[PDB]
Amino acid sequence: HMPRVLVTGALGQIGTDLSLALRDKFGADSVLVSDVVEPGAKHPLAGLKGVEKLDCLDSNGFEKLVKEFKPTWMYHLPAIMSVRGEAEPDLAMDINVNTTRYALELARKYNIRIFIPSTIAAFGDKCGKTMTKDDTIMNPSTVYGVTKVYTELLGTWYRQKYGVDFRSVRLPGIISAATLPGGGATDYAIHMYHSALLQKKCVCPVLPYESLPMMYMPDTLNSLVKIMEAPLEKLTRTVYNITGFSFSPSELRFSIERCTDRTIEVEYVEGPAQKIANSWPDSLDDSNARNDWGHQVKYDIDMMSEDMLRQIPILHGLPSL
Amino acid sequence: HMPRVLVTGALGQIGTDLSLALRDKFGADSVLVSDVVEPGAKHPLAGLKGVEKLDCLDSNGFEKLVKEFKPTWMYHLPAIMSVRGEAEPDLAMDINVNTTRYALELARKYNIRIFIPSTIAAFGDKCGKTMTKDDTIMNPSTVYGVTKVYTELLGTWYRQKYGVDFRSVRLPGIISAATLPGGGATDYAIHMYHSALLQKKCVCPVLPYESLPMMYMPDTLNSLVKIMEAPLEKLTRTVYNITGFSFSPSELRFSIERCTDRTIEVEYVEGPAQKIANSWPDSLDDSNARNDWGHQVKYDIDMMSEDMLRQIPILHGLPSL
Numbered sequence: 001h002m003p004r005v006l007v008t009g010a011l012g013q014i015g016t017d018l019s020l021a022l023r024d025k026f027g028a029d030s031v032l033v034s035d036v037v038e039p040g041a042k043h044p045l046a047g048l049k050g051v052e053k054l055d056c057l058d059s060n061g062f063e064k065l066v067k068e069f070k071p072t073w074m075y076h077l078p079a080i081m082s083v084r085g086e087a088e089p090d091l092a093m094d095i096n097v098n099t100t101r102y103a104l105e106l107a108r109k110y111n112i113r114i115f116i117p118s119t120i121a122a123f124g125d126k127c128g129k130t131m132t133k134d135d136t137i138m139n140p141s142t143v144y145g146v147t148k149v150y151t152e153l154l155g156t157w158y159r160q161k162y163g164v165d166f167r168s169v170r171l172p173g174i175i176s177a178a179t180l181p182g183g184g185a186t187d188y189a190i191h192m193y194h195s196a197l198l199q200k201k202c203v204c205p206v207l208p209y210e211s212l213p214m215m216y217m218p219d220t221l222n223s224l225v226k227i228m229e230a231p232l233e234k235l236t237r238t239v240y241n242i243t244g245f246s247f248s249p250s251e252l253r254f255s256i257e258r259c260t261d262r263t264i265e266v267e268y269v270e271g272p273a274q275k276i277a278n279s280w281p282d283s284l285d286d287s288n289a290r291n292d293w294g295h296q297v298k299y300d301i302d303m304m305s306e307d308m309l310r311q312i313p314i315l316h317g318l319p320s321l
Numbered sequence: 322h323m324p325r326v327l328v329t330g331a332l333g334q335i336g337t338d339l340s341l342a343l344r345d346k347f348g349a350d351s352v353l354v355s356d357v358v359e360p361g362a363k364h365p366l367a368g369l370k371g372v373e374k375l376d377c378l379d380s381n382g383f384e385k386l387v388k389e390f391k392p393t394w395m396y397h398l399p400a401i402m403s404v405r406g407e408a409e410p411d412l413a414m415d416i417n418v419n420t421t422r423y424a425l426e427l428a429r430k431y432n433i434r435i436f437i438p439s440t441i442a443a444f445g446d447k448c449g450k451t452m453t454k455d456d457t458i459m460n461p462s463t464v465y466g467v468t469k470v471y472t473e474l475l476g477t478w479y480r481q482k483y484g485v486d487f488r489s490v491r492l493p494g495i496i497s498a499a500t501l502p503g504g505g506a507t508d509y510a511i512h513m514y515h516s517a518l519l520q521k522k523c524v525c526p527v528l529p530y531e532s533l534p535m536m537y538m539p540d541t542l543n544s545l546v547k548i549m550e551a552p553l554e555k556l557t558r559t560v561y562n563i564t565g566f567s568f569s570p571s572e573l574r575f576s577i578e579r580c581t582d583r584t585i586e587v588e589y590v591e592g593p594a595q596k597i598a599n600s601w602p603d604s605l606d607d608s609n610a611r612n613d614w615g616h617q618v619k620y621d622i623d624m625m626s627e628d629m630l631r632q633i634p635i636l637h638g639l640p641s642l
Contacts (some may be wrong), residue, residue: 093422135458310571
């Protein structure tokens with residue numbers, strides 16, 4: 001008595017862990033996962049069955065896959081995110097605007113319950129940055145943000161017009177031990193944990209007191225399954241803020257140093273992430289999600305740090321303790 | 322010392338009258354106007370020179386025209402509007418989302434000051450319907466509205482990222498004597514004037530006390546030129562509410578009956594327009610436009626009605642007085 005689940009953009013951070021959690025909960029031939037490239041050699045789902053190559057800009061191949069697999073749920077996860085979007089805006093528009101439109105059409109044509117994530121990047125500096133509401137001014141300063149406002153609104157219209165069961169959350173910063181640190185908006189956090197484990201200098205591009213809403217991956221995974229399991233009648237809206245807890249870089253540093261009893265050498269040197277982060281909320285009001293469908297958080301910042309400092313050596317072979 | 326002006330979607334109501342006003346102000350070889358079809362036989366600019374056929378979904382033809390004409394201003398006016406958009410959403414998305422993206426890219430590549438209109442249709446029922454602000458919640462219930470929120474935000478991002486001089490107003494209901502009445506959201510108004518002149522029954526699909534922001538075409542034309550003439554430094558934003566005055570159907574009826582001293586036989590019978598109109602503002606706060614660039618209105622509802630009742634017989638040969 002269980003869903004058939006298509007995941008697109010499955011090689012991302014969320015897509016990888018979600019795919020594995022869905023397989024474990026619903027069995028692996030109940031779950032098909034896809035992405036535009038094949039899993040890299042050491043990628044967590046390299047070698048596994050029921051992972052496919054699919055360019056979501058190839059609308060025929062996209063429909064062919066939906067036609068053959070017959071999903072009842074789809075997690076449509078491809079996105080060019082905030083930092084990379086500012087370098088490759090053509091691709092962010094193609095992915096985040098065109099493949100969203102195709103995905104919604106397929107959800108309509110094939111009767112699929114469709115999850116498309118939005119993001120705190122859909123907010124900008126007029127949002128009311130403290131305990132930001134579900135409904136407020138949306139003035140995003142990144143093209144990624146701009147495309148996600150459109151995705152929210154387009155999905156919602158599909159719901160009203162065609163009865164497409166469109167569901168979404170605005171993802172906060174998502175922390176996990178699998179992620180590698182580059183230049184993403186909230187990547188300083190993961191760089192910080194690596195710096196602590198390697199006992200090397202951490203140059204942090206987000207300013208020390210710039211708070212953001214954040215969550216640890218297990219809580220995210222839980223809520224992403226849970227919003228899809230809810231019956232439609234419990235949902236008063238299509239798009240929900242969700243949060244775990246807020247922190248700034250100085251607070252994260254504090255949590256890590258507390259667990260290790262070692263001071264991280266940190267220099268706060270503004271980078272591209274700062275100006276973006278500063279346009280985003282400090283914290284979200286996620287009370288609609290709590291009330292309608294039971295969004296819950298088990299991790300606080302210190303439980304998260306304990307788990308991160310234990311996992312990262314295991315998953316990436318950095319030094320432990 | 323004058324602009325070179327490209328108008329796209331020039332056969333619409335605004336496009337036709339604007340094209341003629343720009344020609345008269347700047348000379349006709351300073352103005353190129355285009356649309357996807359040729360002007361119908363009796364259309365106001367049938368026969369004229371410097372009107373072209375161009376499918377704005379043909380991005381090469383679009384660039385070829387910009388390349389050859391070398392505009393310094395572009396009024397990018399094609400749109401599938403609120404009622405028709407609900408019947409042809411594929412076309413509204415193609416036009417209102419894809420051609421907007423092309424137009425902005427061209428404005429960037431070719432250094433063009435670009436006007437793309439938005440609309441009160443970008444608002445929905447959470448906007449704060451009285452004296453709606455420039456910045457508020459945008460929850461449009463029509464696909465046309467959804468695409469215009471995206472246009473606002475995308476244009477604004479082009480401005481910030483690339484220095485594209487993107488300018489926009491949220492058009493209220495626009496009244497003019499040239500328009501013919503069909504099923505558009507605010508077409509009851511024009512049907513009402515025809516009913517009065519023909520002394521026939523008027524079946525009105527908007528409920529009698531449903532107020533909307535409105536303006537008469539000459540004031541619109543004025544503001545559309547004026548926002549483009551402003552120097553960039555006077556503009557504190559890219560998108561401006563503009564209004565003339567608000568009315569409901571009963572108020573319009575009142576104005577017309579007052580000018581004619583004849584009672585119109587009106588039956589208020591809800592149609593598709595009502596539910597849409599009811600999600601839109603009653604009135605707009607246009608004080609930013611007034612302050613930054615001098616938006617001004619000469620017509621009130623009775624001056625408008627006097628002019629409409631004089632023009633419509635002249636332009637369409639209905640009975641006069």
